[PDB]
Structures are given as C-alpha cells and as structure tokens.
Design an enzyme around this catalytic site. Structure first.
Site, mmCIF file in Angstrom:
data_model
loop_
_atom_site.group_PDB
_atom_site.id
_atom_site.type_symbol
_atom_site.label_atom_id
_atom_site.label_comp_id
_atom_site.label_asym_id
_atom_site.label_seq_id
_atom_site.Cartn_x
_atom_site.Cartn_y
_atom_site.Cartn_z
ATOM 1 N N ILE A 132 -41.440 65.646 -119.514
ATOM 2 C CA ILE A 132 -42.508 66.607 -119.267
ATOM 3 C C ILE A 132 -43.407 66.816 -120.470
ATOM 4 O O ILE A 132 -44.394 67.550 -120.376
ATOM 5 C CB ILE A 132 -41.922 67.966 -118.831
ATOM 6 C CG1 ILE A 132 -41.376 68.740 -120.030
ATOM 7 C CG2 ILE A 132 -40.801 67.761 -117.838
ATOM 8 C CD1 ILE A 132 -40.695 70.041 -119.659
ATOM 9 N N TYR A 133 -43.083 66.206 -121.600
ATOM 10 C CA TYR A 133 -43.909 66.321 -122.785
ATOM 11 C C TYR A 133 -45.015 65.281 -122.731
ATOM 12 O O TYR A 133 -44.792 64.131 -122.344
ATOM 13 C CB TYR A 133 -43.060 66.145 -124.040
ATOM 14 C CG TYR A 133 -42.183 67.331 -124.391
ATOM 15 C CD1 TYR A 133 -42.437 68.090 -125.522
ATOM 16 C CD2 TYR A 133 -41.102 67.688 -123.597
ATOM 17 C CE1 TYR A 133 -41.639 69.164 -125.854
ATOM 18 C CE2 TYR A 133 -40.302 68.756 -123.922
ATOM 19 C CZ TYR A 133 -40.575 69.492 -125.050
ATOM 20 O OH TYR A 133 -39.781 70.566 -125.377
#
Lengths: 247, 432, 484, 461, 144
Positions: B363-364
């Site tokens: 999710i980064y």
C-alpha cells in the site's frame, strides 16, 4: 557440476532446511486439481484459464535476445493473469519457514515471485505456474496441514501458540480437524466454498519437531549449532570489513 | 590490472582484452558521448502544445485556462517550426545542433549545442533554451497578440517559474531538474526504467547495459570511485552490465529452457571456483565448504553478473516485470547461503531489492518497477548494480504492467530511440 | 459613552460586523487558520486508472455497486480507522469527525447509480453552462475528493496530506475488492493514489525558500480562485473578484508571510466602492462590456487598459483626498496603493477577459499613485511593482506566466506583503466577467463545492468576520485527549 | 505501571506525543555574542549586563507580536545561557540557565570547553504559530522578534547601514536550527523530523543530565526516537515500538551484566575502562544479546505472542544489542554493527525477519557502518532520518538514536553532539518533560498531559 | 581538519563529538597529503589537475580534472571527488582502525549525507549545491 550444499549445519534442522531448499521432499498425501483450483480462489473450479493479455504466439514479442533465449513458461505462453498463493507457518516447529518456502520456490520453480513477511509467504506467478507450485507445496511434507495452513488475508497465527490439537488460532477458519483427518473448504481468500477438501492426517508433535526448519531452544537450540553461527559471523565480518575497504 | 573481453546483445565478440580502467565514465569516450547527449538533448511534444493552445489545458495536471484558446496549427507546419527552433537554439552556424522532426510531426527532438552545456553549470541549459526557442517561434511566426503571449508561453513551459519543475509543460528530456536530486551527483540517476526500456526498443541486454552506463557515470560523479573503489566499480560495470567474457549470456543460454534461480547460482559458483576467484577457507562438520574471496572486487563482480543473469532467467520465464522485486533479493540470499561469502555489493543490492519488494507489492506508493530510478529513495543505495536489472525486467515484460512503457515514456522513447548510441550501448562502448 | 484609540476598528467589507486589527490576525481568529487547514488536508485522486488496473489485471468487475462498497469502505477507513485486518492503531473517532470522501464524475449515467450520500453532482451544484463547461473539461472521468483529518495536518504538516491519503486509499481497495493485502496490484493502486492520478493544490518549493510542499507559496492564484466558490453561488462578477481579493490577502499576506496592515485590503469598503464605480464606468463607455457574457468583452488592447486603470486610480485618489477616512493610522500610507491597484486590476480584467490586462492595470495604478502623491507604500513595497509592468506580457523563462498559473513562489512575489491577494482577485476577475465555471483547475471548483466543510468557501470574508467575533468552530482541536 | 491500550497511544490520540514534537519544532537557538561585537565595534555603544537584562525583558514579553493574543500565546519566553561565568551572574535569575547549576561539575566543564566563552539565547515561539503552518517559520519569527528587540532596547533608528550590519549579525549569522532543509522527494524545510539527527534527539532529552546509569539513558532515547521518528515522520502498524512490556529493558540489563562479567567493567561510566572496538568484541556482545533475547522469546511463548509481528521482535533485539555494544566500546558505529548483527542472527535463527521492507535498512546496514564513502559513511551521532538508508520505512530510528546516546553515555559524556541543544532543553519550564520522555507518554495516554497551542479561549464552547 | 580531528568539532555549528579525538599532525606534512590527493583526484597522470599548498601548510587548493567535469552532469562532482580523496589520504596516513574511519570521514565531509549540504566539512567550493539554487540555471550566479 557444482553440487550445491545449500546451507551449513550437521544438525537435524540443517538437514531439513537443506531438504526444503533442495526439493527432495517426500509426498505425504494428494490433492486433486479440481479442488486445488477451488481453494486457490482466483477462478471457477474446473474452468478455463483466464487471461490478462493475448497469448505470446499471437501478439508477438520484441526483438530481444533474452526472450529468444529464455523459454517462457506454459502458463505465461497463454498469457494468464498473475495470481498468488500464500501461507502462514507456525513458529512452533512448522516444517517450513517464510524464508525457506521462498528459498524452495526460488530454487525449484521457474518464473515465480516469492515474498517473505514475518507471518506471510507468497508465491506470485502465472495461473498454470502457481497452481503447480502450490500443488507441490501442499502435497508434500513441506506443508504440515495442521500447521502450515493457507491464508490469503488475516494471517495471524504464525507466532500465536497452537491449539490443543495442534492447529493455529485462525480468526476465520479455513481448515478444521474434526472427522479425524484435516479438512478445509474455503480458499485462501476469506470467502466460503461448497466443496470440502480433505488434506490428510496431521503430523504428530514429535514428527513435527523432527521435520521442522526452526531452531528452537525446546527442540534444536540455535546456540548449540556453532556451524551456522560461524556462517553468520563470517558473512557479517566480510560485510563490515569489505564495506570499510574491499581488499 | 583487469582485462575483460566484451560481448554484444547476442553474445558475439566485440573487443578483447580491454583494460577495465579504460571503461571508466571519466575515461571512456563513448560513455562521455552518451552522457553529453543525455545532457544536450530534449524532446518537444508538438501535439501537446497544440492541444494546450486549443483546449486551454496547460500548467499542470487537471488544469485548463478556459476562454483563451489559441487555435493554431503546430503539427501541420511542424517542419518550419523545426528549422526556426534550430535557428534559435544554435550558438553558431551548424556547430553540433540538430532539430529533427519525427513520427509525422507529432514530436520534435532538440539537440542543444555542446557549447551551451560548457557555458552553464549544469544540464538545464538545454531544457530552458529549447523551451524558450519553441515559445519564441510559436509567438513570432504564427502571429500571437501582445496579451496572448503568456498563454503561448505556458503552452510550452509548465507552471514555471511558479513551480520549479515545468509541470504541465511539453518540453522535457531524460534528466529531470537538479532540485530533484536526493544526493550529491545524483543528476545522472533521475532516469526511470521505462525511459531505458523505451530507448533500447525493449532489448533486455541493452537496457541493462545502458542503465549500467548511466549508473556508473552517476557513481563516479558522486566521488564514490576514488583509489581502489574505482576498480571495484569498474569490475562490476564490465561483468554485470557490459557482458564481460559472455558470462551473463552464457549463464542465460545454459539456464534458458529449464533454469531457475538455483541453477544460476550453481553456474556462478562453478565459474567463481574454477576461475580461482574463491577458494575453500575451511570445511565444517557435515562437509559444508566455507568459502573465502581471493579477490573481493572480482567476487562482487561475479555476484553482480549472476544477479543480472538471474533477473533474465526469472523474468523471461514469467514474462513479467515484477519479478525483480524478489529475484535480486533471493539470488543474493541463496548466494550467501551457498558459499558463505556476501552477495553483490555486500548486501546493498539485497537491501535495495528488499525495499523494492515492499514498495512494489504494498500500500506504500512505490508502484511498478517501470518507475524506479537511481535517484528514487528506495533504490539509490546499491552502487549501480540494481537498476540495470530493473531496466532489463521492464524491457522483458509482455504486458502485465499497466504503469507501462508507452503511457509514461512514449515521447522519450520515440525521440531517443532515434539515436544509435542509445539503442546499442554495448556496441558504442565497445566501439564496433 | 466616551473613548479614544489610535487605531481604526475595521468593519469587514460588505458586512456590518467589525473587528479591531489585532484580532483579525491568524492567531486570534480561528477561521483564518481553518480555511488554510481546509486547503491543506484536501487532495484529489483519480479513480479511472485505478479502476482499469482492477479491471484488466485482476479480471475484476467494476460496477456501481462495487464502487458504492468501495466508497463506503473508504469513507469508514479515512477517519483513521482500520479496514484491513492487521492489529493497527485507530485514530480516536471524536478527534477525526471532519474526514470524508466524495466522488464527482463527467458521466452523469455513472453518477446516477453511485450512492448520492457520496456524490457531488455537477448538475445540482452548477448552472447549465457551468456544468456543461466542467463536464466538457474533465472528460468522462471519475475523480474523488480526499479530506484527511484536520488534527493530522495540524500536528505534522501539509505534506502528509497526500501520503495519509495513499496509505488509506490502498487499504480501502484491499478491503472492498478482496486483494491479497500486499501484492503487485496494490502498488499500482497506491501509486495511482500518490503520483499518477494525484492532484493537489500545493506544489513543491525550492529549498532556498525555507518551506516545504503544500504551503501557500505553492498554491497558485488560479488555484485559490478555484478554491473559493463565490463564482458558483453568485452572479455579480465584481463581488466574485473582491471575495477572491479578500481570501488571497488573508492566506497569502498574513499566513505565508507574517505591521499587519494588509487586513485593510478587504476592510472598510474602499476597494469595493472603487470597483463598483469603474465597472459602472466600463458599462457606460465600452457598451456594457463588463457585464456577464462571452462575446460582449472588449479585446485587451493597451489603450483600453490605460483608460480603465487611469480612470479607476483618479477616482480612488479623488476619494481619498476628499475623505481620508481610512488614513491616519500610525504606519500610514501603505495599503493605500494596494487597494487602488486591486481596483484597477479587477476593473481591467472584468472588461477584457485577460488576466494580464488586470496585472497591467495594477502596475499602471501603482505608477499613477506614486507620481500623483510623490510617495509609494512603505519601505519594501515596490520591488515587484516597479518590476512587474515589464514582466506581465513577457515570455521569458522566469518571467512569462499568466496570472492564472502565477502564485507566491513567482520570483517577484516571493517576499513582499500586500500584493498576492490582488493578483488572486485579478485572475478570478478575468473569468468571472465572462461567467466561466472555472479559471484554471476545474477539479477544485467541484472539490470545494461541498457544504460539509467547516469553512464556508461561498463567502470567505464573511467567514473571516464570522470568526472574528467568536461564533466559528474549528476542526483540529484536541478536545477530549486533554484534561479539563 | 500506568500502561494502557495501544489505541490511545497513537500520536494523534495522545497529547504528549504532540506536545513534545511541538516543543522540538518551536525552539530555535540564536547566537548573541557577535551581535554584541557589532554593537561594540561600529555602533559606538558599550554592551553591559544591564543592557543584556533590558534586552531580555524586551524580548521575552515581545513574543506574542507585541511592541498576537496575549492570552493564547504564553508558552513563549527567551532564556540565556553562557559558557562564561564572568557575565552569567549579573544577568537576571529569571532569564538565565546556569550550566553550573543544572549539571554536574565535569559535565559542565565539558560543556564550557565545547562552547568556549560565548553567549547563546534559547527562543521558544508560541505553539499556535507552529501548529498553524509548519514549524519552518520559527527562524523567521524569532528573527523579526530579536530584530525588533535590538531596535527597541538598544535605541537605534530603523533604516541604517550599521543597523543592517547588526541585523545580519543578530539572526542569520549564528542560528542553530533543530533540523535543516530536505532533499528531492520529501522536501520539507528546517525544523522537521527528517532533519532532526540522532545526536540532536539524544541531546534534546535530558536523562543524561539527571541520571548516571547509561542503560536507562540509552533506552530513554530509544523510546523518544521510536515515537518521534516512526510515528510522526513515517506514520501506524503496532505503533507502541519498544517502550512497553520491557523486554528491551531486560535484554539491556542482561547485556550490561554480560559486559561487566567478560570485560573488566566496560559497561560502567568512565572513559578509562572502555574496550577498543574490534569485530570480535562486537560479534561477541551482539551474538550473546541476540541469543539471549531469542531464548527469552522461545522460552516464554506469551511474549512471543504479545509481540505478534516480526518487525518489533527484530527491532527490540537489534536495539538491545546496539546499545550494549555502544556501552561496551564507547563507539556508536560499534553499536550500529551490533544492531545489524542482531538482525542477521535473528533472521537465521527463525527464518523470518519483518514485513517486506523491514530489512531495507539492514541488508545494506552492516556494510555501510564503517564506510568512508561519500553518502555512505557518517558517525551515528550525526545520522538521522535524512540518511539515505534510513529515510522511508518504520521501526528503526529509535534504536539508532539510542545507540548514539549509549556511546556518549557509557563514557559519561555531557552531550552527544550539541551542548547548545543539551543546555537549551535543560530548563524545566517546558510543558514537556524532556528529562523523562517515556513517562510523559504514559501521562499522555492516560489523559493527564495538558499541552499548549490549543485554541479554546478564542472559539465557542 | 586537524582541529576537527583533535577537538571533535565536526559537521556543523556547535557540533562536538567527544571522546573520539584523533590526534594527528596534518599541517606539518601537508606536502605529502598534497601529492597523495593529486594522485587520488586525478584521472590520469599529467592531466589538468593541480593541488598546491598555501603558506604554512594550513590549506591546499584542489582543482579537479576537466574530465571529471565532462563526465558528470553538473558542476560539483569536484567537491565530492576532492573530499573523498582527502578522506582516503587521511585514512591511508593514519593507519587508523576501521571503527575510527567515520570520525576521520565526517571531519572532512561534515554532516553530509544527513544534511543536503556538507555543513562543516573543510572541503568547500564557491558555488552552492545544485539543490540550493533559486531557479533553472542560477547555480553560476552564487558568488557574493
């Protein structure tokens, strides 16, 4: 030519780590293809393999030497989607380890994407490739079905202590022990399924401690295997010394 | 003194017994020409300027100046724009300046003179002089009103000078602005992998090689190659990128049909042992051969060459660009396990692969391998032994990535694949 | 029934409510900070690229019901709550109430079936030509309005507004669309949500300037004219331009730069009186040009700017000399050129449709004022004003820019106070005279067209006055986590 | 002791988190002596302690924008400290910080020898100002304040060339900021957690001033670094990082026992009994620390369960090993080498380390420790989250600060990298208690911390 | 550099690294450091490289080759090559332990790479770092 030794250690867990890295694993039980595809969860079971781009014999390739030298997998030659299989392995003598399944998938399988978390271990590949990789992981001693159970999300239980019947504390139960043999219905994704998949009989606690690849002060303490601590010290001294001056 | 041979894209001999000191970024004439061309060349999206002038959309992402559309004809009259911009960008009469129109007029390629590069302190002279020449041409020889001039200027430049980048502008080159450098000397590392694979027409030996060219030029510009470290970098530049003694292509042809990461490791450790690079230090109980390096720059060169070879074997098998998040990592990890010696770059490329796996699989906001460059905060750590493999993976893909070569680098690819020393980096650097 | 001061208590322009100049500062009054907090915490990311990566690369079906599920998942996830099952720490619900996400689309057919509690519709919020302009501008694209907590942006900075967004976007996609919680799709989604499809109002600043990104130096004048939604709700273009003047002189001259004179550029009504006079003058002279309409505008020639700007300044000079009511402050004589220049700039833009016409009117105003009275502002005032008249119609590297793309990071406008608000008003006036739906960024007109904001972007100066007398409630306060 | 849920410890949900970051981001240190040299040399005015005092009443009450809101702004004062006792006594006792009074004798002697005979002023601007926009106008706010205070107190006109020379000598000649500007991507300005180096955070907390056990000082910096760097700069995911349930404390005290057993008292204070840092010493202490912590995890399964994710197991083993090696050798890069050896030993013992990227800083960790290449080599006292390896991912920087403090606390140093920062935060009038940071978050998670910067007086109820 | 190494004042204003004092004479044998740095900076022998010592041996003047300017995209690879050459000359002439290599490095490079500038390193050029430019092409007008 070069017989790979794969890992240092005269102990039992060094031998089991070598067995997981090498792939000289014995098959303990069998899973059919129809319900294995069901419990992967990216497809209707017993259906056609989907696509994410047209097959390579149709839409061509660039003029690349690596493309003409590396033969792509059959699961990529049909242009399948890239989908995943992942597991969670207990820290109480599970036969496999999140690094050591990644080492297994790296040495023994073409075109995979192994990924190690602390509790998760994922293999991402084309459809026909990850199906074979997950099949070889499930039917062998490498996965203890009471211990190394398929999660796809909400994976907590690698470090949680086992249940009294030797199964992880799963916040959504894919695998249940009753009826004697271990059975499971859901896929790795948290959606239920109609069909029930038997895996087999779980290993006993002493057999689990024999087959494991975890150094544990209960079973095979890490401190007493000086052969592998010497490996860590040698590679660390080389890393530090050659990061100062590489001579 | 290390004397490698040089092999091409297809593993044919190019130049033999070349001294690896001559392959330095500061000594090799071809690397100097490549980086001077990267400095001096810039690309103009004429259709982008036309759309900005007509629709009023300019100055950034999702912006539109509404009511002041200038209905011009830039694509149709592109050739006269090319000679007029060539007239305003050159310093003297035909010194080394070229303006080429391509692809039926949708784009322009502007080579600034070599003098303007040596007249300023960095490379942005080419960008600013090209953008101002294009702006001045579209104002003066299409007849722009006095109060309509800033619209015609911000059709070419972006929101510059209010934003330090020409954001929304239609003029850009391979290198981005020096305020966008994470470190000192990182200006030759703002070059994403999609640009490299787009330039080399998705060749996988060539994208890796040209990213080696750029990465080691950047490393020498960092001051990270002085004294013996210069040999430590040039051995890797020869062995990993520049296909020294056909080693990487030999390993790939050996492990093409059936090969995995493990067979690549067996091939490199057999080559390291038989070449006398490494030898058995001690033998443990259960016969685990502990290994030591007779030459540590050469062992790091073998681990880098094996890293690129394993990238080839593990990405061409899947025909996917995402595998180098883990291929570098697990190659170097199994290589540490196999011999006891540290992997390539003494764990630096393994750490780069570790962080690259996390920003390319979570999710980064890292995204696919196509957007990662040497100036990226994650992949900057390894000293030029990681990004060649990333560019090779991007060039090796077969359509499973949406953040793809065309969408983010169609302009740069179709303008910079027109240069021979950019499609064929090894043949330029070898010189044949 | 007696008293003396040495300072004139300012009535906020257009309103009956009055505040002394030492509580119209960005420390005492709260809406001054709240409007900038609403600029900070807001970002916009685009959904179409993320949706098509879910479509082709997973084989997943994108449809209105999955999109309703995804926005309800995200709108739960955004206020710092856990949506993917890792034992993460949740931000407390009572500190985080000002978080929501809302879509707006260029396709009305798609816009119907998405849940109306999460949809800002172009049709219900704009008139017919406004909506047609914006639907034609953004294409048939789907975008969404991200507003992170005020406590989060208040605590750390405004550069975490895009990063908290992309971190809580990806967990929402994972929880609502059943990905792996970490695989090669999530990188594509969260890089779309951070640098591919992200649009944010504040851009990066050079390091020589000692501030960071998403700080009002990066917020361009057209961006701020698009933030304030007076053009959406009102029709009189001079009112629109002067509302933007007030908001710009507050957020640009009081926050981005710290004698606090420049409050008077939107206080006491001098600026208005002058603007209403010269809009009447243009309507009388150039055949009703400064009324709403597209073809009635006069072309921006030099003589038109000269006539309008000179006449507006001589009206302002005659007003001041006739009643020096706003004068006689201890550091007097500055904020005397700003209001004349703002009036001339709005007057030049409302007649021509060109914003650089308004800038040339501004600089003509400063020249006329200086050589009428023999004095021009305080010490540091005419760096830019003495530069500017030759920098407006140029097309050089660091000089050429429309007002619409200009901002406080422009080289002339970097360090002087009392100038940027008039520029924001000029850039608005260039388009409000022709009734444009937007000036530069159509995304921010729609994004701030919402009534759940604690600030009211319909009238910013009314909100400054409303907060100046303590009936404004902000959002980022630590109400529960402190003792009583 | 007062430990609570992790839910009300997240940094937005906890007052003292926010107030110590506000206190760090609102403080700047300005040099004062060469402004007086300007005033002596070419203003013709002889600076006296009476002029200094009058300057202090002018500058301390001028902080709220006076000649903002008097009520809101109150957490604002300027204090002075000198390394020269000749004028430290004539200054008023309400604006002075004695290095002699607040410190022990040898620590004060080290501080005075480091700074010399110079005078420095400690400026704290209001918190509301630092909360409204970023904390990058502390420099410019205090600049305009001290310029106004020269012009007011010392009676010059505004608008003279000598006044301009004084203006540059006042504020942009000797300005000590907390952090500096940032590179490309995360391009923040000064006084941000990216630029706040590990020696700076070691100097900001004041347990080294008030305690003589280097283990407690090291773990105190570990807790403060974990919260500040991880939660603020990088946040989260099990945010209570290594300052609850005291496994790290147990491992550190065991390591001090091991060091004072094998080596001749090398972990106690004093620079005479420090063993020189070789690879053998680092290997010995780091491996013993890691194997002890691993045996504690594998021996007590409830603690293996409580730390559920591998990131915090790896962080608490590496931090304990790092502070141990730093205490034993007096070298901070020895502590870094112990940290990375602990990471590798943990990985090989359990075959699992962290969450995809929790090993980025670690595989290129051990190799970069002793390097002297350009962007690769730096002492751990000068490192921070702007360092190329440590820039982007959680779970590491707190141990990195605690290692530097353990190096300069095992030998009983007065300060890690700055004496200006050490004396500047050595005043008890801060809302935060920098002497004991990890107790204050216990107070900040129990709703007993009362920060300033609130706007309750200027808003409705 | 000598005062930084002996005292411990390296890497910024007010910074002091205590206890790691590396007592050494740099000004006394500055000629030897000069030919060693000429050896490490240069690309080839007899190029456009000249380092010469100032009166009293208190300073020396590194001039990087023209090829290290041509082979780099910007101007200040000269700073980094000179700083690294001086650092390695100091390491080669101590005989220092590698656990005291970072002290001898940051005495020369300052607080870089943590700071975007060197900030206290005695290697200092005339132009500022390219990140500390005002606009596009202002790096050559940073001479006061």
């Amino acid at each position: 030519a070069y017989e790979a030794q794969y890992y240092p250690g005269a102990t039992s867990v060094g031998a089991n780590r070598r067995k997981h890295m090498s792939g000289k694993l014995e098959k303990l039980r069998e899973i059919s293809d129809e319900d294995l595809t069901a419990v992967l969860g990216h497809r209707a079971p017993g259906s056609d393999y989907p696509s994410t781009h047209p097959p390579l014999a149709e839409m061509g390739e660039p003029a690349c030497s690596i493309r003409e030298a590396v033969a792509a997998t059959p699961g990529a030659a049909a242009g399948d989607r890239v989908r995943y299989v992942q597991f969670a392995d207990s820290m109480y003598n599970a036969p496999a380890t999140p690094y050591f399944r990644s080492y297994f998938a790296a040495i023994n399988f073409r075109g995979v994407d192994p990924g190690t978390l602390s509790g998760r271990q994922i293999v991402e590949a084309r459809e026909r490739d990850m199906e074979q990789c997950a099949k070889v992981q499930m039917e062998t001693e490498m996965t203890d079905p009471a211990l190394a159970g398929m999660r796809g999300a909400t994976v907590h239980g690698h470090s949680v202590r086992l249940q009294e019947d030797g199964v992880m504390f799963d916040m959504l139960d894919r695998r249940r022990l009753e009826g004697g043999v271990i059975i499971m219905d859901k896929d790795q994704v948290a959606i239920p399924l109609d069909r029930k998949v038997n895996l087999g009989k779980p290993m006993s606690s002493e057999e689990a401690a024999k087959r494991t690849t975890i150094y544990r002060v209960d079973n095979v303490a890490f401190r007493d295997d000086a052969e592998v601590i010497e490996w860590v010290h040698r590679v660390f001294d080389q890393r530090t010394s050659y990061g100062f001056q590489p001579k | 003194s290390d004397t490698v041979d040089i092999y091409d894209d297809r593993g044919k001999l190019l130049e033999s017994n070349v001294d690896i000191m001559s392959l330095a970024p500061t000594r090799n004439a071809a690397i100097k020409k490549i980086i001077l061309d990267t400095k001096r060349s810039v690309a103009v999206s004429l259709a982008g300027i036309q759309g900005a002038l007509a629709s009023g959309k300019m100055g950034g992402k999702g912006r539109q100046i509404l009511g002041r559309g200038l209905n011009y004809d830039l694509v149709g009259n592109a050739d006269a724009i090319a000679e007029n911009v060539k007239n305003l960008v050159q310093v003297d009469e035909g010194d080394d300046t070229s303006v080429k129109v391509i692809k039926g007029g949708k784009s322009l390629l502007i080579q600034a003179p070599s003098s303007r590069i040596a007249a300023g302190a960095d490379y942005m002279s080419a960008t600013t002089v090209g953008a101002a020449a294009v702006t001045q041409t579209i104002i003066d020889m299409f007849g722009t009103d006095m109060y309509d001039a800033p619209i015609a200027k911000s059709a070419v430049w972006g929101s510059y000078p209010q934003t330090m980048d020409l954001m929304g502008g239609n003029v850009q080159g391979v290198l981005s602005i020096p305020q966008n450098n994470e470190g000192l000397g990182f200006s030759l590392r703002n070059i994403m992998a999609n640009h490299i694979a787009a330039i080399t027409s998705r060749g996988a030996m060539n994208a890796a090689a040209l990213s080696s060219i750029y990465e080691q030029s950047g490393i020498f510009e960092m001051g990270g190659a002085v004294g013996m470290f210069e040999r430590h970098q040039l051995l890797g530049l020869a062995c990993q990128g520049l296909n020294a003694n056909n080693v990487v292509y030999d390993i790939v042809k050996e492990n093409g049909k059936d090969g995995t990461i493990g067979t690549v490791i067996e091939s490199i450790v057999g080559r390291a042992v038989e070449d006398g690079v490494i030898s058995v230090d001690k033998t443990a109980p259960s016969g685990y051969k502990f290994y030591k390096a007779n030459d540590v720059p050469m062992w790091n060169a073998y681990a880098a060459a094996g890293t690129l070879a394993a990238t080839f074997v593990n990405c061409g098998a899947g025909r996917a660009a995402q595998n180098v998040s883990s291929t570098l990592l697990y190659f170097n990890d199994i290589l540490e396990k196999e011999t006891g010696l540290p992997g390539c770059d003494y764990g630096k490329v393994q750490g780069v692969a570790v962080g690259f796996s996390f920003f390319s699989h979570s999710i980064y906001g890292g995204g696919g391998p196509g957007v990662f460059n040497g100036n990226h905060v994650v992949t900057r750590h390894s000293r030029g032994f990681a990004i060649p493999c990333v560019c090779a993976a991007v060039a090796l893909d077969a359509g499973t990535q949406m953040f793809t070569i065309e969408s983010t680098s169609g302009l740069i690819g179709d303008v910079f694949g027109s240069i021979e020393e950019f499609r064929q980096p090894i043949k330029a650097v070898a010189g044949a | 029934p007696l008293g003396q001061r040495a300072i004139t208590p300012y009535t906020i322009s257009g309103t009956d409510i009055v505040a002394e100049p030492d509580d119209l500062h960005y420390v005492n009054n709260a809406a001054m900070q709240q409007m900038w907090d609403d600029i900070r915490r807001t970002c916009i990311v685009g959904l179409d690229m993320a949706h098509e990566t879910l479509e082709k690369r997973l084989g997943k079906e994108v449809t209105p019901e999955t999109i309703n599920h995804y926005l309800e998942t995200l709108n739960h996830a955004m206020p710092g709550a856990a949506v993917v099952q890792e034992m993460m720490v949740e931000t407390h619900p009572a500190l985080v109430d000002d978080c929501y996400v809302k879509i707006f689309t260029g396709d009305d057919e798609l816009a119907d079936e998405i849940d109306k509690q999460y949809v800002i519709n172009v049709n219900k919020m704009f008139s017919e030509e406004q909506a047609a302009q914006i639907k034609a501008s953004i294409g048939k694209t789907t975008w969404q309005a991200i507003h992170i907590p005020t406590i989060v942006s208040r605590t750390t900075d405004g550069a975490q507004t895009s990063r908290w967004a992309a971190m809580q976007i990806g967990m929402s996609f994972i929880s609502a669309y059943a990905m792996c919680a970490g695989e090669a799709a999530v990188a594509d989604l969260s890089f779309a949500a951070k640098h591919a499809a992200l649009v944010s109002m504040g851009e990066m600043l050079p390091a020589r300037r000692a501030r960071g990104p998403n700080e009002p130096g990066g917020l361009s004048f057209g961006h701020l004219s698009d933030i304030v939604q007076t053009s959406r709700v009102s029709k009189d273009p001079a009112k629109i331009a002067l509302e933007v003047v007030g908001a710009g002189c507050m957020l640009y001259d009081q926050i981005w730069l710290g004698t606090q004179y420049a409050t008077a550029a939107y206080t006491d009504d001098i600026l208005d009186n002058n603007t209403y006079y010269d809009v009447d003058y243009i309507n009388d002279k150039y055949n009703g040009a400064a009324n709403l309409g597209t073809d009635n505008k006069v072309k921006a020639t030099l003589d038109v700017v000269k006539d309008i700007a000179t006449e507006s300044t001589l009206y302002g000079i005659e007003t001041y000399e006739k009643f020096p009511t706003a004068l006689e402050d201890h550091f007097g004589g500055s904020q005397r050129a700003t209001v004349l220049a703002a009036a001339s700039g709005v007057a030049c833009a409302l007649a021509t449709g060109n914003a650089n016409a308004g800038l040339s009117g501004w600089y003509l105003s400063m020249y006329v004022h200086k050589e009428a009275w023999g004095r021009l502002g305080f010490f540091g005032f005419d760096l830019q004003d003495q530069c500017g008249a030759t920098n407006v119609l140029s097309y050089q590297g660091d000089e050429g820019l429309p007002d619409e793309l200009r901002g406080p990071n422009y080289p002339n406008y970097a360090m002087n106070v009392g100038h940027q608000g008039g520029y924001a008003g000029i850039a608005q006036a260039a388009h409000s005279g022709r009734g444009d739906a937007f000036t530069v960024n159509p995304l921010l007109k729609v994004c701030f067209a919402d009534e759940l904001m604690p600030f009211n972007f319909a009238e910013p100066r009314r909100e400054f006055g409303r907060g100046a007398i303590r009936e404004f409630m902000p959002a980022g306060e630590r109400s529960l986590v402190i003792p009583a």
